[PDB]
């Protein structure tokens, strides 16, 4: 969910980038 | 703690972290737009008097 | 709504069946205004119809939605210290709204894990006069008539 | 205040009531030299502030009394040894037979250091009547020997308790914000601060004004 820091929306709602949302 | 405070708001001693904004009309420390450099009160009172270049009440 | 008699918003004709009602039914299945992920389910049900009865999901609608329309329900009133919940006729307009609603709720009750299955099945049992939505229909009609004692209260 | 100085509290009694406030509050505070510290704060304390229990918010005044009494005597024992008692045995009166005439049934227990005399004739024996007359003399004593611990203690407290308008020892007003000690004459300006336990100073002064006239 929008709080699961290890997924897609996890970072969308967060506003960051990580292993679970590389830079395109 | 107001006058003796702006007398610490003028300089930029040790480190920059302690460099903090401050209104010019008064000693306001909160809600100060680096741009104008004035607090929201002075800012409002001036924008009202007209002493502000190109500022005008929005509307949409 | 004390001045104007409000206004009956218009339903845009369907975009497959062309029914101003086949949409009113999807609208109730629309959570968060996602009409695409809603109409999809509905259309996936119509395929469960044509895949479990040659009957084209059209008469399975004009029938299941007609066998659910409550003729009269109960609308409470209070003359002054009177806990009388008077029974009375239903506006043709209202009827539809009450129907469709009970249809979705009922659908959302069945044990079918998918979705369209539930809508399809509930539509079958309701056309075939035996669906949870009709259970609420008779349940409502029991309250009604059973209180014809308050017939002089048709406000 | 008694939790800052280090003393220990015992809430012997506290009781609510109808709308809002408190009906009766009786507390026991210990620690070395405690009475001497809360003895000056014995009177009626006046308050003047905007009334919260009013619609207009009018400025109102409130009075409340504070009494102080140390914990001295505690035991409860009155063993009247038959050392000061003069028991008499007079002949029974009333019905009976030969035995009421000839047997010294009636008994009179006389309390010599007081003057009170109890008698008994209920039964037909002397040893059960002098013992029944002591179960009565002990009772009437247990009320007239405690009535004096209530009359030696109703003038031992003092006098300042009218609670009326004009009998105040200290005035607390949050309107203009100040505390007025009517004994010494001092006028402190921290009322919301005195309502936290800072009393050492006005107790310092109340123990000079009080024990300065004797």
């Amino acid at each position: 969910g929008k709080g699961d820091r290890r997924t897609r929306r996890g970072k969308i709602w967060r506003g960051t980038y990580g292993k679970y949302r590389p830079r395109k | 703690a107001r006058k003796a405070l702006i007398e610490k708001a003028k300089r930029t001693p040790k480190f920059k972290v302690r460099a903090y904004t401050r209104c010019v009309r008064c000693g306001r420390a909160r809600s100060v737009y680096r741009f104008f450099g004035l607090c929201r009160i002075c800012l409002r009172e001036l924008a009202h008097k007209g002493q502000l270049p190109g500022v005008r009440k929005a509307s949409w | 709504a004390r001045r104007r008699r409000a206004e009956v918003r218009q339903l845009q004709p369907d975009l497959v069946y062309g029914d101003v009602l086949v949409t009113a039914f999807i609208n109730k299945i629309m959570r968060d205004g996602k009409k695409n992920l809603a109409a999809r389910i509905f259309y996936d049900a119509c395929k469960i119809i044509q895949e479990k009865t040659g009957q084209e999901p059209l008469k399975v609608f004009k029938q299941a939605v007609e066998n659910v329309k409550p003729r009269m329900e109960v609308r409470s009133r209070r003359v002054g210290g009177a806990n009388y919940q008077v029974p009375m006729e239903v506006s043709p307009r209202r009827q539809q709204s009450l129907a469709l609603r009970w249809l979705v709720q009922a659908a959302n009750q069945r044990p079918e894990r998918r979705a369209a299955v539930r809508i399809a099945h509930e539509l079958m049992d309701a056309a075939e006069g035996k669906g949870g939505a009709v259970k609420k229909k008779e349940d409502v009609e029991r309250m009604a008539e059973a209180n014809r004692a308050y017939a002089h209260y048709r406000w | 205040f008694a939790e800052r100085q280090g003393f220990q509290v015992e809430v012997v009694d506290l009781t609510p009531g109808p709308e809002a406030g408190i009906d009766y509050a009786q507390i026991l505070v210990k620690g070395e030299n405690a009475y001497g510290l809360l003895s000056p704060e014995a009177g009626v304390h006046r308050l003047v502030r905007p009334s919260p229990f009013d619609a207009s918010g009018r400025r109102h005044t409130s009075f409340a009394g504070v009494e102080v009494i140390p914990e001295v005597d505690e035991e409860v024992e009155v063993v009247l040894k038959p050392e000061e008692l003069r028991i008499d045995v007079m002949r029974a009166s009333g019905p009976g037979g030969q035995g009421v005439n000839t047997t010294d049934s009636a008994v009179r227990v006389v309390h010599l250091p007081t003057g009170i005399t109890v008698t008994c004739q209920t039964t037909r024996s002397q040893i059960k009547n002098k013992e029944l007359a002591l179960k009565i003399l002990k009772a009437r004593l247990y009320e007239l020997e405690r009535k004096k611990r209530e009359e030696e203690l109703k003038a031992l407290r003092g006098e300042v308790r009218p609670i009326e308008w004009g009998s105040q020892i200290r005035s607390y007003v949050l309107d203009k914000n100040y505390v007025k000690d009517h004994r010494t004459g001092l006028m402190r300006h921290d009322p919301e601060n005195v309502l936290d336990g800072d009393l050492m100073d006005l107790i310092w002064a109340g123990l000079e004004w009080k024990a300065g006239r004797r």
């Binding site: - | 007209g50 002493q51 270049p53 190109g54 | - | -």
Partner: protein, 206 residues
């Protein structure tokens, strides 16, 4: 606690600014602050003239100081000694060319800031405020106008029960834009409180 300033509400159209000059987000702060230090210094040495306005234009590294007044005199002196020592005090802290100017006000009664300072003085000189207002207003409408309005806050006469004497004449639709209404606000400073006065002078239209 309603009503909003009638100036910042007319700025757009009706009433013009009082300091127009584009600027970049890196100077505006320092420059805008300059204008204030100017209205601050012009505040003191000039009150004897009736500084009913101070328009300041600036193209770059210059200044268009224009002090409108209804009675110049003391502004210059009698040739060019004061207005000269003012450009002196000015540039004595302003790195630009203080291009000063001075307008005149024909009808000083139809200028709010003026009528404001006016009454603001009749107050400090212990006058029947109940009168001074009905008299200052009985000055405008006669000396040509369509609406007039003055307001004085609590402490009139010194009574602790702070009042607020109203008093207006003519017409004063603060809601109607096409009208142009002069607004003023002076501050009497007495021994007790610190009164406040507002001036509302109605003028043109279209």
């Amino acid at each position: 606690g309603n009503k909003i300033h009638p100036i910042g509400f007319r700025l757009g159209i009706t009433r013009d600014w009082e300091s127009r000059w584009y600027a970049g987000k890196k100077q505006y702060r320092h420059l805008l602050l300059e204008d204030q230090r100017i209205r601050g210094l012009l505040e003191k040495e000039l009150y004897s003239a009736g500084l009913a306005r101070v328009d300041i234009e600036r193209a770059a590294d210059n200044v268009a100081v224009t002090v409108h007044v209804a009675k110049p005199g003391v502004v210059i002196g009698r040739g060019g000694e004061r207005i000269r020592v003012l450009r002196e005090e000015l540039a004595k802290l302003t790195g630009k060319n203080v291009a000063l100017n001075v307008q005149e006000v024909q009808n000083p009664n139809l200028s709010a800031p003026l009528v404001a300072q006016r009454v603001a003085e009749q107050i400090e000189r212990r006058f029947a405020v109940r009168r001074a207002i009905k008299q200052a207003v009985q000055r405008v409408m006669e000396s040509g106008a369509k609406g007039a309005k003055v307001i004085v806050s609590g402490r009139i006469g010194g009574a602790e029960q702070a009042r607020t004497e109203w008093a207006a004449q003519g017409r004063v639709p603060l809601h109607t834009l096409r009208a142009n209404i002069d607004y003023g606000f002076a501050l009497a400073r007495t021994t007790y409180g610190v009164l406040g006065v507002k001036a509302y002078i109605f003028l043109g239209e279209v």
